Amino acid sequence: AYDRAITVFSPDGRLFQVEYAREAVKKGSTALGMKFANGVLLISDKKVRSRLIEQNSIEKIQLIDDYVAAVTSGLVADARVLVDFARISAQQEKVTYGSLVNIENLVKRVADQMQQYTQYGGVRPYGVSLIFAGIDQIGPRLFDCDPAGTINEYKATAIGSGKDAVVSFLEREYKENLPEKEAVTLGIKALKSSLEEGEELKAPEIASITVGNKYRIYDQEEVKKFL
Amino acid sequence: AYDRAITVFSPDGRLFQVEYAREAVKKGSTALGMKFANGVLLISDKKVRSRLIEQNSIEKIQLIDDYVAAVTSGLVADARVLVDFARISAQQEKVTYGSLVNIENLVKRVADQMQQYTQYGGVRPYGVSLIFAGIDQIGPRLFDCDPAGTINEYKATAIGSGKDAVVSFLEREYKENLPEKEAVTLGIKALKSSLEEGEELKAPEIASITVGNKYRIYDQEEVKKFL
Amino acid sequence: AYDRAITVFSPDGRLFQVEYAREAVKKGSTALGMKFANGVLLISDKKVRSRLIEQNSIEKIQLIDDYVAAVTSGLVADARVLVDFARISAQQEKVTYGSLVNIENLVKRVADQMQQYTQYGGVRPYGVSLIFAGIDQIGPRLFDCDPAGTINEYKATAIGSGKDAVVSFLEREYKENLPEKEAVTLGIKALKSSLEEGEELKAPEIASITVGNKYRIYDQEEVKKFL
Amino acid sequence: AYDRAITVFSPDGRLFQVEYAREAVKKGSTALGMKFANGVLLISDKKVRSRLIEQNSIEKIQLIDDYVAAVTSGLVADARVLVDFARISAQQEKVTYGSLVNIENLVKRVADQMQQYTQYGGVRPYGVSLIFAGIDQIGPRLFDCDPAGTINEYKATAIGSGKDAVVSFLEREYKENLPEKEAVTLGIKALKSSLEEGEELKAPEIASITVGNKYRIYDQEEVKKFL
Amino acid sequence: AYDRAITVFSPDGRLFQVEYAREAVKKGSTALGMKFANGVLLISDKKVRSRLIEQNSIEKIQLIDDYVAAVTSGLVADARVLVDFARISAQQEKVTYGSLVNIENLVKRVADQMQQYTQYGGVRPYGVSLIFAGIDQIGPRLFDCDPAGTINEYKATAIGSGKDAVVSFLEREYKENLPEKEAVTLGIKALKSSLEEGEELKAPEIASITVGNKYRIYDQEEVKKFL
Amino acid sequence: KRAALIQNLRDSYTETSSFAVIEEWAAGTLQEIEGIAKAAAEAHGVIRNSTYGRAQAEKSPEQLLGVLQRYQDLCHNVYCQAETIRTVIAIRIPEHKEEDNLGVAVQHAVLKIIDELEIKTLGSGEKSGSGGAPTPIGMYALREYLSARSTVEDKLLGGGSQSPSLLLELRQIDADFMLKVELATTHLSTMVRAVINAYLLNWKKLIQPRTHLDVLYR
Amino acid sequence: KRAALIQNLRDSYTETSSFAVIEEWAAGTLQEIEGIAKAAAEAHGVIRNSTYGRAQAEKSPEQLLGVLQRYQDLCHNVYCQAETIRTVIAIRIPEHKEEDNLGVAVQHAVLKIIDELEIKTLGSGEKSGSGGAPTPIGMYALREYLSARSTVEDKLLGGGSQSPSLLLELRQIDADFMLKVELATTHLSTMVRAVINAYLLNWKKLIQPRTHLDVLYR
Amino acid sequence: KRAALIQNLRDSYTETSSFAVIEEWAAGTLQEIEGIAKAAAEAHGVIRNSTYGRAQAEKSPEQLLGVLQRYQDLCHNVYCQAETIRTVIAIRIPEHKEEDNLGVAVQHAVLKIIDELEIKTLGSGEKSGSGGAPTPIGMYALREYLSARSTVEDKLLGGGSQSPSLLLELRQIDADFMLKVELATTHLSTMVRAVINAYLLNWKKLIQPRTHLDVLYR
Amino acid sequence: KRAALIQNLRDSYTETSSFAVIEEWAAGTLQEIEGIAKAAAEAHGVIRNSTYGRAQAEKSPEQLLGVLQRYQDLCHNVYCQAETIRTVIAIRIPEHKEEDNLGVAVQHAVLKIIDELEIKTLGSGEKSGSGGAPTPIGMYALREYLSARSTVEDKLLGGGSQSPSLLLELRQIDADFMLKVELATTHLSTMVRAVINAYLLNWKKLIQPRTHLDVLYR
């Protein structure tokens, strides 16, 4: 078979090793983002693993700068290395031009790195998907990115195990330009949609940013009022 | 078998990995270009995937400069990387000589990069075809380019899944030197020809350029009047 | 078996990957060249593929400089890269010495590049043959060159699918020092000889150069008068 | 088996890929050289392939400088690259010391290059043998050199298909210090010895050099008088 | 099995490729060295192959400098490349310190090179053994060296096909501090010991050096008086 | 002329020849099989209820002979039709090469399933291999039956045989041969459906197992 | 229309057809098998206690015939049901390719275990292969029995036979054939459970052995 | 002289020898096969309609003997002709090497399909292997028939035999041997067409399985 | 002395021993085979024309015995000669190594084709394997014939047997055994030619399967 090496096309024109890299993404917990009235938000599930782990330790929403955030899903080591790359790439743009004008280009620079590892032998792809959300001179922006290096801009999207349940649910309920407080509810509903059989939804992370402002991370007291 | 490595000829003299790379191109949506009276145009199908994806996000016609455009079909990550390479390559020609005199040479520089990845071990070919259309000191120009690095200049051509239905249809109806408004109709007919059994054709992209002018992208309101 | 890698001799002392590279050359359309009275000429078949392809686009005789031309046969992408290399290599000789004194050395430089890719692992041979024809301080010159890097100087030769029919036919009819107009006829007869069963010979390309002059490409009106 | 890679010893301490490289040498036409009274000569068979090939094109005796010549047998592309390397290596010795004092060292430099390609992976050996003949401050010199990088100095030796017939024949007839005209006859007899059953010997090449003089290439009129 | 790659230990901790390299050494003709009263000598068999090979051509005892000599056995190409390396290495020591104080260190430098090629993939070991004999500030020295990079200092030793017959015979007869003329006899007896069934021993090479003096190579007239 | 010979071969057994077979298999053949299956199950019911005496060894039951012949008739048409499909493929196996055999593999894959149908499911050969005969009953079912019964009949007639079990065996030969037909029809149906699906999904490459793309060379 | 033909095939043998079979196997079938196992073991007890005389060669023991026919009846339903499962899979084996066969392998894997059930465990073929018949007793158990007994009965009746061991063999044929049913039922049970598990864990890919993700191309 | 010996061999069995065979197969042989198929099917019709009595065991049916001998005659010519093709290839199998065997493979491929024709389809060997005999009926068809019938004839003549099924078997032997010929002819036709195609597509390399390009060396 | 033992072996079976055999095969043997082929075909013609009665079961046909003995005599010489060739190769199989076996492979390749001739084509073994016997008739052809005939003779003599088909079988045994000889001779000729070519193209390496080049070491 043709699935043993990143540089080998199958006869139908498939890079199987990329597609398998994508299966790594499904093992992550669900996260979603959606655009609303003059703003964008991210929500991410926290599968608590133990009393003994610090909670404000590795949670999944990471600020890239003051106006841009990201959620990841997939191999955690690779997510880390990509977030840190995204952060350095944003600062390079700021040093060259004094401001990040289009976030699409930060994402494009990250996606380029990811694609590069699907064309040369002797490296494996990054087993990660990302969502990028933030404000720029175009407006609020929501993007995703996968192991292949593939970009899409969304109004709402999800990543992780419960992706399909959540994209399926927003496909039916999502409305443009809700207020912040309702978007967040709609998001929480979508997330609840994805669990099986009367299973608990413990406190997720939520972060939001609205035009003219900086990012704000909801603290878990504020987040509870939506459960 | 002899189809596991880009550097290995079959006994009949075939590079199977290149041919498989070409199968990746067939999975893209159809796009076409054609020359007309003092001009050239591109049309590309938009298979809408979801309400939730931003429409003015990744659509497939990309300006390379003000007088040159491209459509791609195949792996989207690789298309991106090649369009951006094409764009940089155009600017290098402009800085060396102050003007892009022959577009054939921009295409040749891109095609050369693509061929280079079909001769060295340790890299895989780009799974993309491109169409290049624009005006230069020779006149209007229409080219295509494939994973192997193979160039052809056309009067009309297509790329993507529905390539054959479309090339077949233009082989019978295409006339040189139509007016713009009719070329666009003929194009839409060609595209419709390629769908199976009373299936909808949603709004495609259309971009055109006529001698002496700059490129213009039809907005979807103007595009509708041809459906 | 011993045919999976360019760096591996068979037990009889054969590089099979090089021999297979040569099979790529046979899939190209036929082309021939011959020396005549104070001149040399090239002729090449044009298998027209479609109304929709531009004819003065990729045809196969390429000037290397004003006094030297080449036809190729085999993989078109590799032909292109080798013609462009040949062109650069001619200009280097001209900048070092102010004139291309012996064409044998331009060919030798190209053949060397070709041979170099039949000795190192991690690269595949160029799947192309070439014919080089032109005038220099020795006189009129006609050479060929293959994937292996092998050179021969000819009075007449061919390359492509119909090579054997044509080399067989010139082996019987060819005479040294014909006039231009008769050499061209003899050539066309040779080429016709190579088709099967009352099959059409559409307009080929013909280019000629005679001592003291520059190259001239016959335009298709002039070429017709020999059909 | 242990014959798939140049870097792999068999269990009896054999480099089979080198031995196979040597089989490439046997497919070349026969050539011989012998020392005589104050001189040395080379003779090489010309298997004429066609009326259409130029005769004074690739024949096999090549001057390295004015006092040193070489014949090759094996892959022609590799022969070429080695003769050109030998020529450049001779000029380097002349620029460093103003004269080629011992030819043994030119051969040693060439043989070293050839051996180098029998120790590293990722390269194949050169499929060529050479004979080097010339005059230097020691006297007349005759050497041979094989794919393995092995040197021997001879009074007479041969290379090519008919090596064994010829080395067998000289083993019985060869005398030291013949005059030029008789050495050339003896050589031709040796060569004839190697053909099977009343088969023609067409005009070979002969080149000779005698102490105090420069090399001279017999023209085919002079060569005929020995047939 | 574990014998296909130099970098692979067998489960018993064996590098089989090295051991096989050693089998290359056994195909060489026998050679021996022995210490005597204020001196050391080398003797090497000459298996004459043909009237037609020059005798004072490749014979096996090579001076490294005026006070140090070597015999080799194994692949002749690799012997050459190591002797030439030994020679350059000796001159480096002389340029750094003005004198070769301990020969052990010349040998160590050569053995290090040989070992280096038994630890990295992509190179094969040198298929050679050497004996080094000479005088230095310690006294007369006799060393051997193998494909593995293994050094031993000996009073007497041999290398080549007949090693065992000869090391066995000197194990019984050898005495320290003989006079030169008797050591040479003892040597010749040892060598004769190694042939089978009333087989001729043709003229070997002998070279000797005694404290305070330079090396001297016996000419074959002097050597005969010991047969 | 050689190209003309091949062309005459292929013109005479086209893809509509083999498609024709598959349409019949999805409609007519599967229904006739199921009908045989019910006839055989019904005849089994009759025999399960009968007590057998020497009376029964003097007459071959025309109900069972009926079922069995009907089944042999179906297997005959199915074998002849399988061979049409097999011909359509076998004459389009292209030039032998060590490459471009992606289609040739589809051909060898499907031909192999048709071999399984004919040789093993329909049990049509003289001597079956050391693979055994996995099918409950062959084509030559009628013959197997008459033969198995006529040995038991001889022993029971001739002082006959006084073995009480031998009398029951006569009955069991009738019962079992009807069961064997119910089973064999079920198994044949699966195999017929399997082939219908194998063919319809793969036919394109069964006819054209190579495409001649010459677009890289000039 | 070709897609319509495949669709009619698959609509008529859905995943509920095969799941239906598996529910029955977990509830009804395994219980009916165990019941047969206990009937057969009880009949073995009776025979271990009996002393046999010519009296016994004049009558076929209706207890043993009873057990044996009951077992044959189960094997019949299990074969017919196995074939439903096998049909459901066989008609969803997708286009032949040299790639994306991760699902196809699950299919071939589970079909192979159903082949093992039908051919080897239920011993349902005419001639078993050179794999032998590893099952203690086939479907055609009743026939094997009557046949083995009726030869011994002939020899004992006819001056009968005076062999003391031949009389004990008649008994041993009854004993062993009941043992063979205890053993075969135990072994069948394992295989039925093995298939229940094989199926329930793998069904998703048995139906959709490929997913058409087109998300990398545009 | 050694080259002369080989040359005499190859001069006497040229490519026109083997092409000759293939033209006959495409025209004459396939038609004669089909004719035998119809004769055998017609004779089957007659026998399906006959009621058989002891009358029939006193006479060997000259219609069936006719069909069977005609079929044996065809198989004889086809074997002898297959062997011509096989000879043409076998004497052009070149020097044994571990390289340049791309042509040699085409040879071994086609020779293998002619083996399959002769050994397996025509069933021409004394004892067939543990591959079984997959062909419905061999060359030695006439002999198999007379032998199978003459045992049934003895039993029915001699007090004959009173087995009602044994009488029907006599009939079934006639019926089945005609069926076996319909089936074998169908299967033989496929194989003959397969070979026609194998050969016409591959002949070039069957004669010259290597080309001596010396163009890289001097 | 060990080298002297080997040398005596090889001196006594040289390449001229085996070449001698091959010259005879290309001239004498192939012609004697063809002659047997025509004698056997002519005898077949006679028998196809004869009507057979009890008269024929009282006399063994001396024409057929003639053909069959003549054929057995040829097979005897071919076997003994094949074994000369085989000896010439087998005693030159060199020291066992895991290298330099390019020649040894040519030896194993040709020895294998001589095995095929002797064991399979001439059918010279006691019991043939599970490869079957693909040859139409063995060496021990005379014995097979007499044996097959003498059983039919007994039944026809003794009140003889009144089977009409048994009488025809006696005839068919004569017919078929002559056919079997026509076929076997054709097949033997191919194999004999195949070996002639195998040997002439490969003899150099059959004798010297290794060359001792010591030119790289000193």
UniProtKB/Swiss-Prot annotation, chains A, B, C, D, E:
Changing V76 to D/G: Prevents PAN to stimulate gate opening. GO terms for molecular function: endopeptidase activity; threonine-type endopeptidase activity. The formation of the proteasomal ATPase PAN-20S proteasome complex, via the docking of the C-termini of PAN into the intersubunit pockets in the alpha-rings, triggers opening of the gate for substrate entry. Interconversion between the open-gate and close-gate conformations leads to a dynamic regulation of the 20S proteasome proteolysis activity. It is found in: Cytoplasm. This is Proteasome subunit alpha. Belongs to the peptidase T1A family. Changing V76A: No effect on PAN's ability to stimulate gate opening. The 20S proteasome core is composed of 14 alpha and 14 beta subunits that assemble into four stacked heptameric rings, resulting in a barrel-shaped structure. The two inner rings, each composed of seven catalytic beta subunits, are sandwiched by two outer rings, each composed of seven alpha subunits. The catalytic chamber with the active sites is on the inside of the barrel. Has a gated structure, the ends of the cylinder being occluded by the N-termini of the alpha-subunits. Is capped at one or both ends by the proteasome regulatory ATPase, PAN. PANTHER family: PROTEASOME SUBUNIT ALPHA/BETA. One of its GO terms (cellular component) is proteasome core complex, alpha-subunit complex. It comes from the Archaea. Component of the proteasome core, a large protease complex with broad specificity involved in protein degradation. The T.acidophilum proteasome is able to cleave oligopeptides after Tyr, Leu, Phe, and to a lesser extent after Glu and Arg. Thus, displays chymotrypsin-like activity and low level of caspase-like and trypsin-like activities. The configuration of the closed gate contains an opening large enough to allow rapid entry of tetrapeptides but able to impede the entry of proteins and longer peptides. InterPro entries: Ntn_hydrolases_N, Proteasome_alpha, Proteasome_alpha-type, Proteasome_asu_arc, Proteasome_asu_N, Proteasome_sua/b. It comes from Thermoplasma acidophilum (strain ATCC 25905 / DSM 1728 / JCM 9062 / NBRC 15155 / AMRC-C165). Keywords: Cytoplasm, Proteasome. The N-terminus is blocked. NCBIfam families: arc_protsome_A, PRK03996.1.
